[PDB]
């Protein structure tokens, strides 16, 4: 008679999941786990319901200096991350330079609210022309103007007295102070805006000893202006003051920002826009909401985010070869 | 694979087996069916889950890039930043891919080992009382009823009871 039979073997199911090994690839398996995510919404979102600071076509310089076109940001709320275009076009309206701009942006990567306070009022300029510092390269509404947070002081009558102003951080939070120097094309322009021909700017703090002198040269009409405007910045510790003393080519700090919230943030070089959303992970290419430990979207991420690998397929085999 | 069990002397899988990865198929006078060895399947489930989570936790400490800017006279340090943040990415992507490949090959052969171990286990309990067909099955010289079947499965095969019976039944196979 045919005998009873015990047999030994394994399980097979309808899984078309394939996994790769060192010797064999595309091995069909009973159970597998994809460990890599490849899905993004394609739009900037809140992070912990905290809105991003979408600078749009404006730059960090124009936003902090007060470019007439960046007036949309005159008052910004708390942000999780700034979004700045690669080549923002609302930048220095008056051609010039920002001393250690990239460093200032690296410090901005660690802030999460700035409060703008008028350090020196624009009406505090009795000996000098305050509202005469407007230019055609900085248009606010098809008429002329300048950076809002800074004042382009100009001689009164035909006399530009020595400015000797001082501000003490009575505030317990550190302050961000920003000033500037106009570098004109000829000595006639010099004496026209600032009577005194030889001019100097003296900025002094506990860690600052600054003796600037305008550089007059035949430069070119960038933005229609051959003159330049070099901008400088520094951080004021509490119980600490900044002293300005200048006789010409002085761009006076009107507004200054305090570091009220020093959290964690980034500068996202992305051309996307706010999409009325909130996610736990944000990339320059979109937002990710994946429990998978890995991702392949963008190496620069913000928030609770997966790890980034430059791979296209990552699946772990959890079962055995399928029939 | 390394143990010759899956895709080897057991050339196929059981779609009818549903409750486990490894198990047995019986075919006695009373019926034929599939049962699953719950012990080996669990042990494998536990080991596999622990392997995945360990891999994930080891990967969790992985370099994370930060964005920085360098002016047109900081080209050398910009190149340094670029090459380093990408070299860490290269090293880490390799690490992940290679680990996946290796640990998968080892998971597959772990399943192979489990199947071969269970096969040898019952080959050792079913002694001269059973003929080894080679396809992954054993033919009982003495007829093994459902309870007798589970005895083989659960590991409580009281050989001596069927020892005399299957010895007498082997006598006839020995004399034709």
């Amino acid at each position: 008679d045919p005998g009873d039979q015990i047999c030994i073997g394994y399980h097979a199911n309808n899984s078309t999941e394939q996994v790769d090994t060192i010797m064999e690839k595309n091995v069909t398996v009973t159970h597998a786990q994809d460990i890599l995510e490849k899905k993004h919404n394609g739009k900037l979102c809140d992070l912990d319901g905290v809105k991003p600071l979408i600078l749009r076509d404006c730059s960090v310089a124009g936003w902090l200096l007060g470019n007439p076109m960046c007036d949309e940001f005159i008052n910004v709320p708390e942000w999780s991350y700034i979004v700045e275009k690669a080549n923002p076009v609302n930048n220095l309206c008056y051609p010039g330079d920002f001393n250690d701009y990239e460093e200032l942006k690296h410090l901005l990567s660690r802030i999460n609210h700035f409060e703008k306070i008028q350090i020196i009022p624009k009406s505090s300029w009795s000996s000098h022309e305050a509202s005469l510092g407007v230019s055609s390269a900085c248009p606010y509404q098809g008429k002329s103007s300048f950076f809002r947070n800074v004042v382009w002081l100009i001689k009164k009558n035909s006399t530009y007295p020595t400015i000797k102003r001082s501000y003490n951080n009575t505030n317990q939070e550190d302050l961000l102070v920003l000033w500037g120097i106009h570098h004109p094309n000829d000595a006639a322009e010099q004496t026209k805006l600032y009577q005194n021909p030889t001019t100097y700017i003296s900025v002094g703090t506990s860690t600052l000893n600054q003796r600037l002198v305008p550089r007059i040269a035949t430069r070119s009409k960038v933005n229609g202006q051959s003159g330049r405007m070099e901008f400088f910045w520094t951080i004021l510790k509490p119980n600490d003051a900044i002293n300005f003393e200048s006789n010409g080519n002085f761009i006076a700090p009107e507004y200054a920002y305090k570091i009220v919230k020093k959290g964690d943030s980034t500068i996202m070089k992305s051309e996307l826009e706010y999409g009325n959303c909130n996610t736990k992970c944000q990339t320059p290419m979109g937002a990710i909401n994946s429990s998978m430990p890995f991702h392949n979207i963008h190496p620069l991420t913000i928030g609770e985010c997966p790890k980034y690998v430059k791979s296209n397929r990552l699946v772990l085999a959890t079962g055995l070869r399928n029939s | 694979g390394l143990f010759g069990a899956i895709a080897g002397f057991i050339e196929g899988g059981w779609q009818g087996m549903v409750d486990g990865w490894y198990g047995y198929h019986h075919s006695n006078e009373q019926g034929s069916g599939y049962a699953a060895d719950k012990e080996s399947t669990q042990k494998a489930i536990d080991g596999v889950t622990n392997k995945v989570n360990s891999i994930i936790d080891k990967m969790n400490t992985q370099f994370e890039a930060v964005g920085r800017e360098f002016n047109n006279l900081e080209r050398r340090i910009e190149n340094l930043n670029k090459k380093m943040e990408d070299g860490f990415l290269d090293v880490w992507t390799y690490n992940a891919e290679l680990l996946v490949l290796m640990e998968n090959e080892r998971t597959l052969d772990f399943h192979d080992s489990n199947v071969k171990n269970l096969y040898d286990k019952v080959r050792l309990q079913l002694r001269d009382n059973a003929k080894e067909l080679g396809n992954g099955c054993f033919e009982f010289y003495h007829k093994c009823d459902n309870e007798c079947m589970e005895s083989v499965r659960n590991g409580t095969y009281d050989y001596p009871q069927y020892s005399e019976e299957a010895r007498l039944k082997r006598e006839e196979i020995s004399s034709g």
């Binding site: 079962g319 | 409750d19 596999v48 889950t49 994930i56």
Partner: peptide, 15 residues
């Protein structure tokens, strides 16, 4: 992390 193999049959470890 729990992949949940053979549900209602085995206690996948890890939570």
């Amino acid at each position: 992390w729990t992949g949940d193999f053979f549900s209602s049959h085995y206690t996948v470890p890890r939570c």
